[PDB]
Amino acid sequence: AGFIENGWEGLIDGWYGFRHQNAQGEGTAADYKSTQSAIDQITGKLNRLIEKTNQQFELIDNEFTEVEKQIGNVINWTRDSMTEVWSYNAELLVAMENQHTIDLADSEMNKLYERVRRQLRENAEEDGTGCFEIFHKCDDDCMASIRNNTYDHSKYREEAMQN
């Protein structure tokens, strides 16, 4: 997500998609495997995080009738230290899991990018902006064949080597 100029706004159903701009026309489709894996990983991370505590805490301090002042300050200081360390742990965890979510999105993105590279030996190459320059013409069949991960490159090699 670093070498791309901008993200698409018309991509609604899928997180990661595909555009063609071939001679047949213009089409914007959505990949399924990469976005399913990304949503599965992130939802698993959420389900790990979204978990109410098992440990049961009781009332240690009285709001109405104030407890003895020494033990009251001891309880207040213990609760304040626990509150500070919990706020610290919460902000640290939120920051690093947002970082890991962004890195996971980038990892799924360039994993799809590198698997598209692997599917296209020399029939296509990158432009640096996230697009692949196809060296063969197909009537929107090889578009879906790249999309469906059922692309055969060896039959398209002879007309793409000389170009």
């Binding site: 003895e68 002042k69 020494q70 300050n73 500070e84």
Partner: protein, 314 residues
């Protein structure tokens, strides 16, 4: 072309999840070690109690007259600061000290206690400035002239202010029963202190004690906190150190216990016995008991946060 990065001959060893002591081009501090050995607290009101003590500000021994009723956003206590002139302890000592630390200063106002036909000017050889005297806001209620009965007194004081008052009174356990009869007379003295939330009562117990500050008997100062529109009744038959003035809280402050001198050359945040921890780092390793809004204590001597890349020398 050839593409590569920068490096230095001498970098920094930092700790990493995989390897310990890995070499980086540059690194920064996260645990502060440099401690300022001064309580530098410019921007806030401060008082240096010195040879006075924080709890001595209430009762008022000779060392604590200057800071008897003060006002500050920072209170500083010292080891040489004594809380009492006439010897004796404080019940709930740390509770009263922590109340005074958050007092923001204290204000003394008279209770209007009128005593009829009874000598009230206490005088000890220990609590002395120029002659035999006693505390500032405490009144030692002796007998009339000599061994004589002490009439039962019922003195009521009502806190009419809008803030919760603090009342400190004293109990005299004489060095001997004969001394107690000299000062207050014969009979079993019994004293009750009554309030809405306070009803504790107690009996003075004369007996021999070691000579502390050149005196035998000990006076224990009890205390309470009064809510607004609440009154305290002292019903004492004898052997009472009556409160002449009630102490009132002023605001919000914080109390430190240091031993270094005070200046105004900083913007300090937290303080301790070694001085001031002025820094912006998240962690510190100077004192475990630094109090204030500042870095937290850690056990490690030093942690290096890698600011630069992992460098390899050419």
């Amino acid at each position: 072309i050839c593409l590569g990065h920068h490096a230095v001959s001498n970098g920094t060893k930092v700790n990493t999840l995989t390897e310990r002591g890995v070499e980086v081009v540059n690194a920064t501090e996260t645990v502060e070690r440099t401690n300022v050995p001064r309580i530098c607290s410019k921007g806030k009101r401060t008082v240096d109690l010195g040879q006075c003590g924080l709890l001595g500000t209430i009762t008022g021994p000779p060392q604590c007259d200057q800071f008897l009723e003060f006002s500050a956003d920072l209170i500083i206590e010292r080891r040489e600061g004594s809380d009492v002139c006439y010897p004796g302890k404080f019940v709930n000592e740390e509770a009263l000290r922590q109340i005074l630390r958050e007092s923001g200063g204290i204000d003394k106002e008279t209770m209007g206690f009128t005593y009829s036909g009874i000598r009230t000017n206490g005088a000890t050889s220990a609590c002395r400035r120029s002659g035999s005297s006693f505390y500032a806001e405490m009144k030692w209620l002796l007998s009339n002239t000599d061994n004589a009965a002490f009439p039962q007194m019922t003195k009521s004081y009502k806190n009419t202010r809008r803030d919760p008052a603090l009342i400190v009174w004293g109990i005299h356990h004489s060095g001997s029963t004969t001394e107690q009869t000299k000062l207050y007379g014969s009979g079993s003295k019994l004293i009750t202190v009554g309030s809405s939330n306070y009803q504790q009562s107690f009996v003075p117990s004369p007996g021999a004690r070691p000579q502390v500050n050149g005196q035998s008997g000990r006076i224990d100062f009890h205390w309470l906190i009064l809510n607004p529109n609440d009154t305290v009744t002292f019903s004492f038959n004898g052997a009472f150190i009556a409160p002449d003035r009630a102490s009132f809280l002023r605001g919000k402050s914080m109390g430190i216990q240091s031993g270094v001198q005070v200046d105004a050359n900083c913007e300090g945040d937290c303080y301790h016995s070694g001085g001031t921890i002025i820094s912006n780092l998240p962690f510190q390793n100077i004192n475990s008991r630094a109090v204030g809004k500042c870095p937290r204590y850690v056990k490690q001597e030093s942690l290096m946060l890698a600011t630069g890349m992992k460098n390899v020398p050419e």
